[PDB]
Design a protein around this ligand. Sequence first.
Ligand SMILES: CC(C)OC(=O)C1=CN(C(=O)c2ccc(OCCCN3CCOCC3)cc2)CC(C)(C)c2c1[nH]c1cc(F)ccc21
Length: 216
Amino acid sequence: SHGELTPDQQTLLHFIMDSYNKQSAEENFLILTEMATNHVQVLVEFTKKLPGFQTLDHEDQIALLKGSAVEAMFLRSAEIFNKKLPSGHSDLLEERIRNSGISDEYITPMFSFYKSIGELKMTQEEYALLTAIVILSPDRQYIKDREAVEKLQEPLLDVLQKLCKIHQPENPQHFACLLGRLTELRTFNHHHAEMLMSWRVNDHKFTPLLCEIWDV
Ligand SMILES: CC(C)OC(=O)C1=CN(C(=O)c2ccc(OCCCN3CCOCC3)cc2)CC(C)(C)c2c1[nH]c1cc(F)ccc21
């Protein structure tokens, strides 16, 4: 039980959960940019709240936010796909995303990942902690003090590992399976990079915020 957490870890989890919970053709794509813009704003507010984030150098703060935006977007998308989208609309979502321009070439691993995540049946607590862990990655491009980020990420990993034992005691490889998904998640940085290239070749245009956060 959550009695397994120290009061300090309990407080940290409560903080994270409270903040996590405070979150046609060419028109289709416009809808996706709008969704992405909206998520970015949510991601900034969650990011700012992470424990110790404020003790990080400002430039490192920014690089963590930029570095994690795509991984975070896909992790939140997996959550929506599994926890919010009726299974019966699954096909609709995919068909519409196809018709936005995005080719099934990279739509395929996207939905595979969503279903992969679904198979782990992650709790909201795991989604919240994974997101925080994604954001606090010490090995992001351009980070100056990786030690300090590693130091903020460590306690979150500890809490998540305890939560894995707690939610699936008889499945000891669960924590590792989650790390496994973090690997699969990271492949989307390249996928998205490919995507923005093509999009910008077809002159897709973007909001200034997305231009900044996605390096277009
Ligand atoms: C986190 C936000 C929502 O996701 C996004 O913005 C992206 C979401 N993608 C999703 O596959 C996705 C989108 C919507 C979803 O639910 C829509 C239905 C919401 N339920 C309906 C039932 O009642 C609960 C809410 C789930 C996954 C990935 C992808 C790559 C397509 C994409 C997103 N934006 C973009 C901006 C771009 F220019 C180019 C591509 C994207």
